[PDB]
From a paper:
Vanadium-dependent haloperoxidases (VHPOs) are biotechnologically valuable and operationally versatile biocatalysts. VHPOs are categorized according to the most electronegative halide they can oxidize, leading to chloroperoxidases (VCPOs), bromoperoxidases (VBPOs), and iodoperoxidases (VIPOs). The general mechanism for VHPO-catalyzed reactions is based on the two-electron oxidation of halides. For elucidating the halogen specificity in VHPOs, we chose the vanadium-dependent haloperoxidase AmVHPO from the cyanobacterium Acaryochloris marina MBIC 1101721.
Mutagenesis experiments in the second shell combined with activity screening assays revealed that R425S-VCPO was transformed into a chloroperoxidase capable of efficient aromatic chlorination, even on a preparative scale. Strikingly, the conversion of 3 by bromination and chlorination drastically increased from 53% for bromination and 8% for chlorination for the wild-type AmVHPO to 91% and 74%, respectively, for the R425S variant. An isosteric phosphate, obtained from the reservoir solution, replaced the cofactor vanadate in the enzyme crystals. Both mutant structures feature the identical characteristic assembly of a hexamer of dimers, arranged in a “head-to-tail” orientation with superimposable key catalytic residues when compared to the wild-type. In detail, residues 390–404 in the wild-type structure lack a defined electron density due to flexibility. In contrast, in R425S, this section consolidated in a loop structure, strongly influenced by the introduced serine residue (highlighted in blue). Remarkably, variant R425S showed an interaction between Ser425 and a region of the adjacent subunit (highlighted in blue). Exchanging Arg425 by serine organizes residues 390–404 in R425S to a defined loop. This structural variation has no immediate influence on its protein subunit but causes mutual interactions of two neighboring monomers in the ‘head-to-tail´ orientation of the dodecameric enzyme structure. Consequently, the loop triggers the formation of a defined tunnel with the vanadate cofactor at the end. Although the key catalytic residues in the first coordination sphere of cofactor binding are still strictly conserved within the R425S-AmVHPO mutant, the Ser425 from the adjacent subunit alters the hydrogen-bonding network within the active site, thus forming a tunnel protecting the vanadate in the active site.
Author numbering:
A (entry chain A), B (entry chain A), C (entry chain A): 1 to 639
D (entry chain A): 1 to 29
Amino acid sequence: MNTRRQQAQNIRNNAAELAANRPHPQHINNKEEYEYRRPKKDGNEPSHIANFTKGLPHDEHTGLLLNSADYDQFVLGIQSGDTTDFARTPLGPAELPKVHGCLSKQKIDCDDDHRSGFWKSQIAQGAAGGDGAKLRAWESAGAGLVFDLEGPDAQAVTMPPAPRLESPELTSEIAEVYSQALLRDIHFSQLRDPGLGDQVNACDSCPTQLSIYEAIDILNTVQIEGQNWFSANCCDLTDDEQARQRPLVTRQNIFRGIAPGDDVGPYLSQFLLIGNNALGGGVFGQEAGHIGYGAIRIDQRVRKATPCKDFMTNFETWLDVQNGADLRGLETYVDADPGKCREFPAYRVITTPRDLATYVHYDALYEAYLNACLILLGMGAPFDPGIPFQKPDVEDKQQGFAHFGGPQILTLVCEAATRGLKAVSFQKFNVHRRLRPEALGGLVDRYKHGKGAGDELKPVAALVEALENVGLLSKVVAHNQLQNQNLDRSGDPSSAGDNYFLPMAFPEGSPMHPSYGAGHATVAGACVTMLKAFFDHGWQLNLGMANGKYISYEPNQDGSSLQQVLLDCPLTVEGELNKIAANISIGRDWAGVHYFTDYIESLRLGEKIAIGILEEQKLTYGENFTMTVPLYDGGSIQI
Amino acid sequence: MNTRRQQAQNIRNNAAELAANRPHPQHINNKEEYEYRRPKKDGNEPSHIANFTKGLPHDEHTGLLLNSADYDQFVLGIQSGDTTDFARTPLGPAELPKVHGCLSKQKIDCDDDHRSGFWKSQIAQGAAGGDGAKLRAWESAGAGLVFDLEGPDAQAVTMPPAPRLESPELTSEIAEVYSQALLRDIHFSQLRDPGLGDQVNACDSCPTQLSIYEAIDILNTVQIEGQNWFSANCCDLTDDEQARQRPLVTRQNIFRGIAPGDDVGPYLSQFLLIGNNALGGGVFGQEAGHIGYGAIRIDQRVRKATPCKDFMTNFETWLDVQNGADLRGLETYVDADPGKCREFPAYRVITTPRDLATYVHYDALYEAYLNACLILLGMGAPFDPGIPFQKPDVEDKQQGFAHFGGPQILTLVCEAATRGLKAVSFQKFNVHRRLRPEALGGLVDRYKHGKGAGDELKPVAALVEALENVGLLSKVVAHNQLQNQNLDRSGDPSSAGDNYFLPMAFPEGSPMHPSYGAGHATVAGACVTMLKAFFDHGWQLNLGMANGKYISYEPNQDGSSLQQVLLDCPLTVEGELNKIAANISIGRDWAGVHYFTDYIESLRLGEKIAIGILEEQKLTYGENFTMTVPLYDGGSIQI
Amino acid sequence: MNTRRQQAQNIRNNAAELAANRPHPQHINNKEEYEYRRPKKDGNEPSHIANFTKGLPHDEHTGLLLNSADYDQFVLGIQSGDTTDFARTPLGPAELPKVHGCLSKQKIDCDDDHRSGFWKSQIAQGAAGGDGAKLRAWESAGAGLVFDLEGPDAQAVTMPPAPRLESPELTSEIAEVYSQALLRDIHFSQLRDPGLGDQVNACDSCPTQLSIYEAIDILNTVQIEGQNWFSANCCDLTDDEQARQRPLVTRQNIFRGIAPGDDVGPYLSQFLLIGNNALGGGVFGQEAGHIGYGAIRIDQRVRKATPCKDFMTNFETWLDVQNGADLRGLETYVDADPGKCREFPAYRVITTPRDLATYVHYDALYEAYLNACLILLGMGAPFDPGIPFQKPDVEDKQQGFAHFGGPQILTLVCEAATRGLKAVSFQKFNVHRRLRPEALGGLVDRYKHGKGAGDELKPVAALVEALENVGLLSKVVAHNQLQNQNLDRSGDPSSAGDNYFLPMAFPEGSPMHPSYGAGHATVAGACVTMLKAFFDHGWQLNLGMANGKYISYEPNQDGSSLQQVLLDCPLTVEGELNKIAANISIGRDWAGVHYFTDYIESLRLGEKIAIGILEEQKLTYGENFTMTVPLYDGGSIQI
Amino acid sequence: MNTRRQQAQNIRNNAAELAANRPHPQHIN
Ligand code: NA
Ligand code: NA
Ligand code: NA
């Protein structure tokens, strides 16, 4: 034998070696960083239009990257991770220097207690009780360089290159993210084939410049050089692009993930609507929406944000956000009705993408995937049959709580997320640095106003044609027109003119870190993979059945209760975990802060992080069991 | 430089070595295992009265360990961890073999679909809809042998020896756990010095055979060989016992933990009563009891179990539980009132120890410590000033989300718990194997009925004197008398006679694993230590103040809302985290499944697990910061 | 220099490291294991219909997996490899326990000398001279966990996921394996384009419900969701499926392998028909069928099993086999004719798939590939020109016998096979666990009798449609009708009704180990790869030529002698080795125990095992030569 | 536990050492 000290050290060294001896891939970007250029005096420099520049100095007149030297310093700081190198990077509004090639001078500083004059938008000017908005910096840029004790390393795993401005793929994606902004107040029952059950309209009537029927046509018709993303055959596409590729847009498969079981049933996953039966003697049912949080409850009702109230719809509002104006918590929320119980309608069931965007806005990491984990445990969901002490207590003479029970999975959903964020943080900051969809909506507008210098915005030219030739932009300007009649931005100079800016559900828009690699989807992919591994992924949810059809749940007209939907086949653990993975992941896309590529490839990156942890932790147990974890790309694996 | 693969492997090897090079202590029990004996034909064998035997065959007539060979096989199985060795261990009721020294024969098996006849209690006989209760086995016995990737090893950390039946310490502890059973329906406002604010009685009037005033006297007067635990000076006590030692019992310090800040304010920690202010525009306040779970809410109202309804109050009910009768979920809960909102009183505020016992009954691991973590984040609580990117965004030009924000602490509270359970699982199963307080209540009764053989129960003799000489038992028999008038156990033969059994708030009583080392307290200690480390432990909670006194919260008469309590000094993050640590940890003691020693030493074991993880994870970051984590034993440490 | 001891140790350490430093792939199944479910009381459990359950307890009334707990114990035993864990797994017929979730009780045991009453089929009831059939257990389940001194490790190599019940691929495969059962007595001259030479009918006239012309149409027309396997373009298929994919079924390419040279010439490889010229002075020719086994001969005539006599054609016969009834050697064989020499027709030339099924039934591992090796050596076949001492003896002054002659290759064909079996044993038992084609024929029948519970056999529904819509099943029931008129199973209750069971050429059917990964094909692929490596793969076989056409051999009407076939081009060593690889590998498929996927992917797995050994053994020799081993997937490699 | 790769390599190294640690005789004509 060996002393336990040695055995414990050996296993931690074996896990460390196992992690190292796996395939360490090479990180390949789409080369957009230094490809698209613009003009300087007696030469040319890169435009960095296709790069994330949110927080840096943007020209206050043109809304383009003010100084390229700022981005070169921003990039430098990312790779070093030195706190000192962050401090040299200019932030928010700035003045271009008198000597060319030098770093920009930051207008706002520590002695600026009153910051009203620096911003050009009314909202930002009187944001902090009349003082004016504050600067906000980038979030955990050096997290990609942070190591970990378990799972694969952040740079020991990679995502494929982001699609380009010239590509047919991106054109379909920006159109999809654009469409969702105009379809942001649609009732969820509309996002599915009408044969399943009766659909309804959102009780709150909003001005709509786009419907579902139109959106499917636009997404199917949108094309570059006579090629549509959904239409294009395999032969044309690259091995990387062949993987992401989706089919022709259907009422059922619209705005949905490509993970198995996403198509089956309604849009919204049960684990975002249903709860558990009341502890002990049942006072309420699963349709109540109270999760069985041990002896206390979880309310499944999200905070209701005032419908059809999108932000950054004009240039000033957009520019100030892109100049790192801290506008968090300036979005308004519907007040409660004294007559009604359970703080309705202040807190209602997630009825529209807006309410998903709101849920996802403050989601707080792994909440959604823990909640789903809690729901299954309370329901009486079985664990993967490979796991020890799973048989009747009399026969096996052991139950298993500490390491093969609820306790182990409760920690695992939470564990994985942290490793997830670090892994994607590298892909965002140190590799791809893809612009936010809000920025592309920026690029689209500025081009249509003939802004920039020379052939700077020529790359975007191809993109805006398809968006206008499908007739989408014409509806976006109409939607924006009505949004700029709001008193908060009515007097903004840009409100009078046309705006092609993609509406943001949040005043601040996207978080202060690059687009490519989604923080929500990476956590979603990782946390869900752990749940699918541990639980019996096939387990058909016993939500009950009526009239020989297995019942499901979607919200009612005002989200006051759940409307039952009756399907031919029952819902499985796998599908609903994959659906809530997709719901939260695409939940950002509805808010207009992510593309589909950000979701899909993050979900694939997420499972690699999660699988790696499970692989490494298997060295510890001497029971010698098997955990069968299903993947999003077809067949399952045996850990 | 080195390639990232090598650096990542080196850090995981360095963490593994750091863990090994720390002090690996030697595990010392109190030698009770094979000390107390009883008689066999022409010799003597150990009684195993002071050991955990719950689940094994107990003699149906005497309620003592039927065969010592069963315990020797039970012990053997623990140390091996072999699934086959578990299967040989007899469970529940059994028949003593015709040849002596041989293993007992199990009555119940896989062909016993109807198990009514095997049980001697009415409740268990008609438990499973008339079929009869099923056998339940021991929970994760082999978890002590499971290794881990981060933190200290389970056998690389130890707890001091459990107190003995002869000791003054245990006598005070069993009296404390006994008292709590009779004080189980007391309103929490009573568990504090009355000078702070107006106290109240529980709206539900229960027959009480013991009051607070009496309980303090009993705990202060109870003594062995003219020595009281709280009275005894340092000189008399051992270095291990000097640490646990508490002061003379006060109205303020009664049934409370010895962690700093437990004495200050009411009994119940705020993080078990208060919530967050409503997201965005405030529709309700913190006194509401809705935690700011991102965009959804957490209900702080526990399920209300029918008051003054304790179980295992007679021999039959006690014996069947001790014979591993699965009675989970047979406890009844108060129905809701249609007229009232928020499912009242079915779901009410934690008003009595019963409601804490109920909360803790299904607590689901780290819920309480995550909830507390969520509350602080929503409040706007500051992190430990050592942590990077903590200064204004403009100055430092970075915020930190992924690794130095909410995300990192959210995973850490959840992370630590799993490592905690494995560490204590060893101390329970492989080392101390201390009997449950319910078992000691068993030993007390059987002695007072002159059960057992020869000088078997002589060890307990000394214990029962002090309990009777304080006049406690006389009140326990009176409490039990009224409890056995219930129709569910009225017709049980033992109901007619006197019962000295400690009432259990759960029908099944303690979980199927030994007493010493508390699973709740180990998680509590570990999770709270992580919170204290990350957050500014000193941060005075801004709950508001009225009349120049800082306001606090305790429940009202029916737990319909929070009653404000006004203190001279404000509550700190440290104290309330230490109080919720103690609340949940002692929450078991109220249910009657743990002693104080199980709490205190687990809280100390818990922080060692947590600190060890933090120490190891510090190798990853290159920022070079400092986390100042305060300890329960005075001064703070710098990680 | 180094001492030889050190050099010898270094090379064995270098080989060990080389093996480890190669790509270790991750084992991915199709997730069918826990996907398809059925109903239990108040819940749902997995059906394990798509898993190998042969030997376990099958319900005697429905013919489905009796208890899922048995499979969970069966799986557990596989992964542990513990002899004790095998013994707990119930075998053959069993009684479902009174408590649910418990292990089944085995009817047959060691005190059952007379086992007539346990079986439901006449054949099995009077199998062991009236005593009744015995139980048979699973074959080398723990061989996947066995290590090796040379070649790649069993878990250091993997096969792609098995096709699913829903898939178009499987539907084409089961139709192919079904067709072969009805075409089992076809003369081999029919399995090729008729332009090559005159075709003939099997002298023994059997009732045929299917012809070649019909079988090609059925295989080309069979489709799922309007998709045929052979018709489907690359774009639709996955990278794994794109590899297996075959072209539209031709008279030449029907039931043939996709290895280069399989299409060229007749179906049956020469090395299964031809022999060598008589040692010294030629008394007979190559058309004789006597292999030059040094100074003795090998008879190429297989034992003739009585034609059109298939087994397990009814439910009882099928069920008893699936309940592990040991029926080995109950198949009857044609008696010899006293008048004729060389024990004819008792021993005849392999004339029909039946005779191949019979050859392959007792093939005894590597016999076929050694025989082929012996034939080439006797013919005067050249070795790969890279090998040392290959030139005229006078010039080079060395011949090479021990290490570069016959001796080295003779051991290599035999060597590789053992490593092959262990490698695939893992893929069968520990990963894929694909049901046998006989089991799917079982699933098809039970569905058509409306057996099982709820939506248990719904997965198979899609499969049986295509089989009936092509009109195949209608012919299978007709074939089965005539087979159940046999007196051995005439009185079996199921004989009266319709049977859709795929006929088995063996009474026992498939061997006691899962379908996916073929033991014959893995050995075939491995052994043939070694032969192709060593010999000059291109070497055009000098069998002679007549009328300016290179002669070949196929059998005559009664397999009394070889009928010559004249082709435009000569046969190469590569093609005929690939053809005998395919012949033996597909030889199982004719018997109805394997699919095409089992052959193709095993042949690819086989070469990886073989190449790995050759790579490792190259460290030993200091001659520094090159062995050019051709692959089945196009180009050759240089070892 | 160890990863199968390591266990498989260790056994092949153990076999190689076992072979070397046996009596290596001197060849006398
Ligand atoms: Na169990
Ligand atoms: Na900050
Ligand atoms: Na030669």
